């Protein structure tokens, strides 16, 4: 069944594929149900914003390390520097991630800053008090947006020192390539009988 000039196709339908066909007829019904569940959860929970405050965090994998995004939870170091304990932050609506570590002062500072902003912008009700109705806002993420850090200014002075960036890249690659060979060569030339 190889006819005239057409691309080779790879349609994987040699199993009983018709027994597993998910047609999402319930896309609209599920959207309605999700909105209903969000409304019911908002009504059920305290005048609390339906989601926890998340940290700012650098994406891995240089394809994405140029950008910043919401992480799972604030590190223990970040919570301590913001002046809370992990248990109390979890009770007042802060996501806490024991797994994440701080090796970047800029990200650590941004997270401590947004923790301080959140603490200043929330009102914690007393356990046995009155705390008059505080007009629940639904999105901590919308209240505290994640902002991409500004790396440079719009305009600057040209400072070409004659380094030839292409040559710099070539030399860095070559030096990495021949680092081990040169180290072995120096090791063998350090014989000194």
């Amino acid at each position: 069944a190889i006819s005239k000039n057409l691309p080779i196709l790879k349609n994987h339908f040699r199993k009983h594929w018709q027994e597993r066909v998910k047609v999402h007829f319930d896309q609209a019904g599920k959207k309605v149900s999700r909105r209903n569940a969000r409304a019911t959860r908002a009504a059920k929970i305290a005048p609390r914003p339906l989601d926890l405050l998340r940290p700012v965090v650098r994406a891995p994998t240089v394809k994405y390390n140029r950008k910043v995004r919401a992480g799972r939870g604030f590190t223990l170091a970040e919570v301590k520097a913001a002046g809370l304990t992990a248990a109390y932050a979890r009770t007042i609506g802060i996501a806490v991630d024991h797994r994440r570590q701080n090796r970047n002062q800029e990200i650590f500072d941004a997270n401590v800053q947004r923790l301080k902003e959140y603490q200043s912008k929330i009102i914690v009700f007393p356990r046995n008090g009155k705390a008059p109705e505080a007009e629940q806002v639904l999105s901590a993420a919308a209240t505290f947006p994640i902002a991409q850090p500004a790396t440079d200014v719009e305009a600057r002075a040209v400072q070409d020192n004659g380094e030839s960036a292409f040559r710099t890249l070539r030399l860095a690659r070559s030096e990495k390539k021949f680092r081990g060979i040169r180290e072995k060569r120096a090791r063998e030339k350090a014989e000194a009988e």
Binding site: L6, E154, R156
Partner: protein
Amino acid sequence: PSRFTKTRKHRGHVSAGKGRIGKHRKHPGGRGMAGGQHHHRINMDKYHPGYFGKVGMRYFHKQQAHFWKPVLNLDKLWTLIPEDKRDQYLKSASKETAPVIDTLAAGYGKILGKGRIPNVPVIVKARFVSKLAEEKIRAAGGVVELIA
């Protein structure tokens, strides 16, 4: 839709456009890519040379994010500047207060040198640059600042 198909037109015509001698049988040449080396060899070698065999070396667990490096040619190099600022940067082509372009922020990994840019200094920040791209930037009076 069905009312526009040729099968409506074949109603009343016995063979349904499939012929009397060679009918519409089930799989006369085999199923799928059967016989690519034996009875479909001509249609394989023509229109698909190179199909059979191996051509290089394998790469277990290859991740495409390692090789992510979108290329931007010098021919644009200025669509990265917002349109309104572009005119006032093109005018007054000054060595001082030259526009800084973060091509990595724009989503590019290497700057190539296809086109030609105006004689306006630009500070091009990039992970990688083509040799000709860097020389053209320098000839326009700008600089390439390597970033990561």
